Design a protein around this ligand. Structure first.
Ligand SMILES: *[C@@H]1O[C@H](CO)[C@@H](O[C@@H]2O[C@H](CO)[C@@H](O)[C@H](O)[C@H]2NC(C)=O)[C@H](O)[C@H]1NC(C)=O
Lengths: 297, 107, 195, 128, 128, 107, 128
């Protein structure tokens, strides 16, 4: 009081020395339930995959991806991600996700790497120099191979010229090694394009069926449709706490409200154009916010 | 910088004879990022073997990487006249990246 | 608030089909009002060029499910539903796909900053000649962030009476009750009394 | 298929900066994933790394030669270059262009298999 | 010991700006005290001064050639350069790099003994 | 610009004979900033003499600068075969700096 | 007196962009009034126009070849150039540099007498 009044003597007076403000602690973040998971499991565990000549193409949209499930397990033989770190992939929210699945032999898993020379890499399936994606592969000898050899999976071995990135061309007409044409009858200098994989259990690790899922992540002008999951660990009440509800933030005490609210609304406004009530996104209960305790000492 | 020692520096083995190059890093590399490079005389080196054990794109299965951590070993089988060249080991796990002196196999 | 709303006491174009299927602009959003008896209307097509050159938004509210496909389709001269499917011919590129007169259905479509907002509300009515006088607060059904430009839209009718209005940027005073519903509205720039 | 073609002076007089350009073929230099590099081989001695280029033209150099070495790129020309200042006779060697590809892993090491493709090389000698 | 090495095109076609670079050795260009300069000698005629560089890369030029002459420095490259626009056959000459050192005096003339060290020189000719 | 005239332009003196170059500036230079430069044929010029009178670093004492203000004089003694080259005078006192035509001494 | 000198590859392998440069003499390219152009003559066929350059280096091209043709200028080099992408055997012809002068009239047609001066020409053939 002596410092505020700048006098060593004070007598029978009431004085406002300073202002006290309660500081919030235990900042919590609340987001809705992680519902509508993307079906990454479908492409990875598909009963039958497709041969690389016509690799299966998948589009993932309007869902949340738990990339963690793919990268938490150590089962996959090869987990290679180019440009995008698997850690914090959930945070990296992308507008379009493309999943490409094909069965190749082990010697060539390496070929899928961007800018690699190869008979599977250039003639059949080619990733771009700018590939923001991940390459996942596992050995599945007991799943694809059958006794008597496997002719189920096929790959073009001869093509007139290389194919551009992300281009699959199903051509079964007889190939043209030289100048004269045999018109679709297989013969000398005239070979059918498709070549049998011939998968077998007794074969070397290199010549075994390796199903390969290739993820791609794409950013365009269009708004993001494939975001990652968010943490909604705990909700605290009856105390001054800093909250974050759907981008809207604020420091205040969270209490229950007894008045009725509409189902489609999610925010609340006071008469003073200030936030009065905040509806929980994943909980039906309403959280009535109040300003933190502040006054003059 | 990490120093890679190749033992022995020189070898004289008949074709069809098994060879082993002991590349021992001074500091252990857990990632097994040691990669073997074959340089043919008077020619640019090529990637012979990577990730401890690999077959490059066309490298013969005959060559096979081995070892982990402090020491690494390269094994050759059914030696061919085309496999008489200097071999090198490189660590990209820590930077600066360094190469070994090189081992030359002769007839 | 200063948001795009339909002006009060404004003439709206009315189309009556026994068949009328014209093209209408979508410069700043339209207000769709339709009276239905046995689900005559089936869907709406939104497109800038409508000739498969650019992406076109397509919504079909059939009896099985509410399918919404936004892809490049080869539109025909007279798209309709046969109660036969002659809506589109083929597809080239697909970006977004979502699958979900005693009746008066009012709809408002807004295409702002790449977000498509649809407001829906169903109210039972008795008069069938003209639009019944009354107040209705349209609730947002679903939001679609397609991010494409829309210039013209078309209406689809099933073969075995809809009003079209245009929104304008105006100021509107909204009255909220204790439950949060909009009981009445007043157009500021309509009359001196309302001003 | 991504061949690298060295282009440099055959003989350089001393006290002259050494300029060598890799004429890349078929790869946009600014690909993020590729991290091209420079390697030299003094006669009768092991390969020595000079420096690589981080994506977007940013560069990292061997600390030993960092003071006298700069790496430049010319994406407009589809080639990248190495400049070494104050070269001596000992510094000169057969210089080799090289490519590297960096892939992230669950483990988290951005670093990855490297020196997949080497340029033909060019024997450079520095003497009076 | 601060040798200057000229580096320029031997023959330049007309209407082309003339670029010459002095590869300095052992002197930080931005030394404040040194004030490097450009001199040319047309055959059978006296030496002519083109321009010097003030410290920090600021430059001063002979008023006669000031309109068509610019001097640039590359401390990052340990060299400085001269650019002459719209050169003609008469303008071309053996160009010489040079060093100057400016010392203040009680008298107050910042200017001081100059042209202590000259580069080897390079004979440049401009013709169709 | 100030103009420096060198008299005579050409000289033919036997070795061991004393020579004098009269470099007379059109405008007097009080600072005696006139500096003599010796250019050997087909070679870069060197600083021969500065500050009116100096010995460069290792220029022979035999050469000696003289003069002040409007006129300047350079004197040579015990002429040597190595001293047959074009001589120049330059003023750095005022800018632009100019050089003389040059005087060539012959056998 | 404003002679134009064609400079181009005599024989070009297919799938290679065709580059031809006109070494102008005595005319500043950026003169506003002049509008230089490219013409080619396939053997046994009439002259065909490729494109002209609008003043300030802006360019206009024949709509038929517009997709595969770009015109560039190098005023610093006193020459202008034509680049044709994806040339075929049929596309190749004796290419001719040309000058045009555009004068406004009371009538208002900016366009005006053209093809006053032609370059010597260069016979270019594209084949395997
Ligand atoms: C969010 O998810 C939960 C499921 O974990 C939904 O159900 C609630 O579950 C908790 C604990 O299991 C119960 O205490 C609640 O009573 C449940 N809510 C109910 C039955 O309405 C929850 O409903 C989801 N929230 C939303 C908005 O859908």
């Amino acid at each position: 009081t002596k410092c505020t009044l700048k006098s060593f003597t004070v007598e029978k007076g009431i004085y406002q020395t300073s202002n006290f403000r309660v500081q919030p602690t235990e900042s919590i973040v609340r987001f809705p339930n992680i519902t509508n998971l993307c079906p990454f499991g479908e492409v990875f565990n598909a009963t039958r995959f497709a041969s690389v000549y016509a690799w299966n193409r998948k589009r993932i949209s309007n869902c949340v991806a738990d990339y963690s499930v793919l990268y938490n397990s150590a089962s996959f033989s090869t987990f290679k991600c180019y440009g995008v770190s698997p850690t914090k992939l959930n945070d990296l929210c992308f507008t379009n996700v493309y999943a490409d699945s094909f069965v190749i032999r082990g010697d060539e898993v390496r070929q899928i790497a961007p800018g690699q020379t190869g008979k599977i890499a250039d003639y059949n399936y080619k990733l771009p120099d700018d590939f923001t994606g991940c390459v996942i592969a596992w050995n599945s000898n007991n799943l694809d191979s059958k006794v008597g050899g496997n002719y189920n999976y096929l790959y073009r071995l001869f093509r007139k010229s290389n194919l551009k990135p992300f281009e699959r061309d199903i051509s079964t007409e007889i190939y043209q090694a030289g100048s004269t044409p045999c018109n679709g009858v297989e013969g000398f200098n005239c070979y059918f394009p498709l070549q049998s994989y011939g998968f077998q259990p007794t074969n070397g690790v290199g010549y075994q069926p390796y199903r390969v899922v290739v993820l791609s992540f794409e950013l365009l002008h269009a708004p993001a449709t494939v975001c990652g999951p968010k943490k909604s660990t705990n909700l605290v009440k009856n105390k001054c706490v800093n909250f974050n509800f759907n981008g809207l933030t604020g420091t205040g005490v969270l209490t229950e409200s007894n008045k009725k609210f509409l189902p489609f609304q999610q925010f609340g406004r006071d008469i003073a154009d200030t936030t009065d009530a905040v509806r929980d996104p994943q909980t039906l209960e309403i959280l009535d916010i109040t300003p933190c305790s502040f006054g003059g000492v | 910088e990490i120093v890679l020692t190749q033992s022995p520096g020189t070898l004289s083995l008949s074709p069809g004879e098994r060879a082993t190059l002991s590349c021992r890093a001074s500091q252990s590399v857990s990632s097994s990022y040691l990669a073997w490079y074959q340089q043919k005389p008077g020619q640019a080196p090529r990637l012979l073997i990577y990730g401890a054990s690999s077959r490059a794109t066309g490298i013969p299965d005959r060559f096979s990487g081995s070892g982990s951590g402090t020491d690494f070993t390269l094994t050759i089988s059914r030696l061919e006249p085309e496999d008489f060249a200097v071999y090198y080991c490189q660590q990209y796990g820590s930077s600066p990246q360094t190469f070994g002196q090189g081992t030359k196999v002769e007839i | 608030t200063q948001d795009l709303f339909l002006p009060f006491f404004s003439n709206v174009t009315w189309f009556h089909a026994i068949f009328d299927n014209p093209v209408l602009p979508f410069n700043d959003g339209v207000y769709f009002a339709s009276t239905e008896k046995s689900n005559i209307i089936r869907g709406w097509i939104f497109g800038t060029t409508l000739d498969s050159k650019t992406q076109s938004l397509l919504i079909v509210n059939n009896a099985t499910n509410v399918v919404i496909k936004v892809c490049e389709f080869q539109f025909c001269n007279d798209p309709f539903l046969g109660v036969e499917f002659r809506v589109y011919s083929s597809a080239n590129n697909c970006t977004f796909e979502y699958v979900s007169f005693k009746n008066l259905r009012e709809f408002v479509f807004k295409n702002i900053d790449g977000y498509f907002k649809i407001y829906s509300k169903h109210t039972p009515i008795n008069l069938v000649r003209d639009l019944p006088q009354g107040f209705s607060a349209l609730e947002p059904l679903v939001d679609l962030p397609i991010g494409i430009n829309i210039t013209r839209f078309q209406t689809l009718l099933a073969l075995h009476a809809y009003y079209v209005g245009y929104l304008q940027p105006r100021t509107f005073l909204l009255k909220y009750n204790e439950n949060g519903t909009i009981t009445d509205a007043v157009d500021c720039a309509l009359d001196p009394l309302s001003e | 298929q991504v061949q690298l073609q060295e282009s440099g002076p055959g003989l350089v007089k001393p006290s002259e900066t050494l300029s060598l350009t890799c004429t890349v073929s078929g790869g946009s230099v600014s690909s993020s994933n590729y991290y091209w590099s420079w390697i030299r081989q003094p006669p009768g001695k092991g390969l020595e790394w000079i420096g690589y280029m981080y994506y977007s033209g940013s560069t990292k150099y061997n600390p030993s030669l960092k003071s006298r070495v700069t790496i430049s790129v010319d994406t407009s020309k589809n080639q990248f270059s190495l400049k070494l200042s104050s070269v001596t006779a000992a510094d000169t060697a057969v210089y080799y262009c090289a490519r590297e590809v960096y892939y992230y892993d669950r483990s988290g090491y951005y670093a990855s298999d490297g020196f997949d493709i080497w340029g033909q090389g060019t024997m450079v000698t520095v003497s009076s």
